[PDB]
Every structure is written in C-alpha cells, then in structure tokens.
Ligand binder design. Structure first.
Ligand code: CB4
Length: 360
C-alpha cells in the first residue's frame, strides 16, 4: 500500500506538468524519514531513446550556487576568509577598485550594488577579460542596500573563496568538496567515461542545448549531477552533523539568513521560507520579477538560523535544463526535481508543493 500511495502522489504531481511543458525527461528523488525514493520519467535523449534513471546527469544551473556556498563555508571554517572581508583582500588585481568597499557577504547575497544577472556579452571566458570587467565596475547603488540576482556577483564570491584557499575553484570542488560530501556522480567537467549518462537539453523546436563555456561558469551554474547524487547533497544538508566537523560547519554556514525580501530569507546559496506557506507565495518568491528586478532588502539585526519550520530551496536553469531542490530541516524531508527542458519556475514549484504537501 505505502509504495502504491507514494507512486500515485508523485505521478499525479509530475505527469501533468511534464505533458503541459513538453518535458522530455524528468528525475525525482525524495528523502523521507531517512529513506530515499526515486521516480524517473521519460527520455534523457529523444533521438537515441535513452531513458531517464536516478543516475542520468542533468545540468542543475544555479543550484550550483549552493555548492559554491559550501566551498565558501569550508574556507570560513578554516579561517581563510570572513564574510565581512573586503572583496579586494583576496585578489590584488582588484586593489583600488570599487571592490575595496564591497564585502564577500555582499557578493554572496547579490547586494554588491547592481552587478547584473549575466556578465555582458563583451566578457568571454578569459581570465584577463574577467579581471578587467571587475576592475572597471562601479555600483549603481550603495553596497548592502538592494538585491539583484547575479551570476557575476556570487561567481566572484566563489572565485575569491577559492583564492583564500590558494587553489583554483574547479580543482577544490573536484579534489576536496565533492569527495567530502560522498559525491562520485557530480561534475563540473563531465568525464568522457560518464558522457553516456549526460542527458540532452531541449529548447525551441527541440533544439539540442548543453551549456557552453562562460566567465565564472563553474561558480555560477556549472554542476552536472544525477538525482541520486543531488539527493545525497540534500541529505548532507539535512544532517550536517554526520560529516567530519569542518564539512559539518561548511554546510551549517549555508543555513544562515542575512536579510528578507518579501517572504524569502536569503542565505549563502539557499533561499528560505516559513513552512507552511501557500503555493502562490512560494511561486512568487521564485518569480521572474524577484530574479530580474532590484529589491530593497530588510537586513536582519543578526544572522538567523534557517532551520525548523522552514523550507530551503533553490531553482536552477540553463538554456536546456530546469532544476529545483527543496528541503524542510525540521521534518527530515528533501526533494530534487531535474528536467531536460528549461520550464517555468512556477511549474517546478507546483510539482514540489504537491509532493511535499502529500508527504505531510
Ligand atoms: B540560475 O540558473 O538561476 C542562473 N540563471 C541564468 O543564468 C539564466 N536565467 O536566469 C534567470 C532568468 C534568473 C532564471 O530564472 O534562471 C539563464 C541562463 S541560460 C537561460 N536560458 N537562462
């Protein structure tokens, strides 16, 4: 009976949304009172008929920001940086720039003063171009005052966290972070031996789309992972105490809220809501206006623990893919939804809300 009821709940949430958004393939993974449950739908590749499984690799886009935040949490645990550091402390090229007056916290939480959603098209994936972009950038408004969701912002946060540890960002993730979290199916650069698992992404007229190189891509949006590995990461977030102590502290650093915008409390990577909350309010917090427009923040007088009666979440998108992760610390409940079409955030949240409501 229980396996039949859980399958009926997840199918009822997923199937109409896959049909309505023409999603070729979708993987669900659920952590429920310490047990994993997987539901796999459709095709990883339409052309070769490869089916989605819990081992299929998807692009998770900005869910990568929670991994970037975890690396910064490790640098914090090691006393190699502090969130109140000026950004230019960690990169001499930025000395004398406006990054002398911008904190690592500002970069991590998109409050540096109007760093845009993307690097401009004039900035290619090239160390000198990225360096020169930051050297010349000037805030539109005071650092710390307005949230503008931004790849160059948290990208530079990750880049500087890696500099504080004295190694390149991609090497630290591969050699230290993924192994510490027990993640063997999680990649910034998918090995040749694993390419057979890499789903195709789909856009307009089913154009094939896998993410191409971009400036600070690894830090902002570069992770490819399976539903099973991403649920292992959610389970690490639900139980940091099970990891070796520096890594427990690194995860805990991603569960601290600094300010509110509407119903959302901003952490490092994770965004949190009170739980329960209406589906419409969870959709609104993950809406296009929240992501694309500047919002004045309401700063907390001290950092707030993102635990208990809360939902922590993150959306992630690339041209071909749409991911969503959510978990409820105080209920030991976690959810991953990975798809190979970039379909609306509101639809991702609709699936998740139906599942989380029915596990409740
Ligand atoms: B992340 O996945 O949130 C980073 N997102 C992006 O770079 C892109 N869109 O950003 C918005 C519109 C905020 C979103 O909802 O993801 C992006 C990259 S390629 C593409 N089609 N969209």
């Amino acid at each position: 009976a229980p396996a039949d009821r859980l399958k009926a709940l997840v199918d009822a949430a997923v199937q109409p949304v896959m049909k309505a958004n023409d999603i070729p393939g979708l993987a669900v993974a659920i952590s429920l009172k310490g047990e994993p449950h997987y539901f796999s739908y459709g095709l990883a590749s339409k052309e070769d008929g490869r089916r989605v499984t819990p081992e299929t690799l998807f692009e998770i886009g900005s869910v990568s920001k929670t991994f970037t935040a975890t690396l910064a949490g490790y640098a914090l645990a090691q006393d190699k940086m502090r969130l109140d550091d000026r950004a230019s402390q960690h990169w001499p090229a930025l000395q004398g720039s406006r990054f002398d007056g911008i904190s690592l916290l500002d970069l991590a939480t998109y409050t540096a003063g109007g760093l845009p959603l993307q690097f401009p098209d004039s900035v290619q994936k090239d160390q000198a171009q990225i360096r020169d972009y930051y050297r010349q950038w000037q805030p539109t408004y005071a650092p710390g005052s307005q949230r503008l969701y931004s790849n160059p912002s948290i990208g530079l946060f990750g880049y500087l966290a890696a500099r504080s540890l004295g190694q390149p960002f991609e090497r630290l993730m591969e050699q230290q972070v993924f192994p510490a979290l027990g993640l063997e199916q999680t990649h910034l650069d998918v090995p040749e031996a694993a390419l057979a698992q890499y789903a195709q992404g789909y856009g307009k007229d089913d154009r094939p789309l896998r993410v191409g190189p971009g400036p600070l891509d690894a830090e902002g949006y570069g992770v490819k992972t399976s539903a099973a590995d991403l649920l292992r990461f959610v389970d690490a977030n639900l139980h940091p105490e099970r990891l070796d102590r520096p890594w427990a502290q690194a995860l805990d650093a991603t569960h601290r809220g600094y300010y509110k915008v509407g119903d959302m409390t901003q952490g490092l990577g994770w965004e949190a809501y009170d739980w329960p909350i209406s589906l419409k309010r969870l959709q609104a917090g993950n809406s296009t206006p929240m992501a694309l427009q500047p919002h004045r923040i309401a700063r907390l007088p001290a950092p707030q623990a993102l635990e208990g009666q809360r939902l922590l979440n993150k959306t992630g998108s690339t041209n071909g893919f749409g991911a969503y992760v959510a978990f409820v610390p105080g209920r030991d409940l976690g959810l991953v939804i990975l798809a190979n079409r970039n379909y609306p955030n509101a639809e991702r949240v609709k699936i998740a809300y139906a599942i989380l409501s029915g596990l409740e």
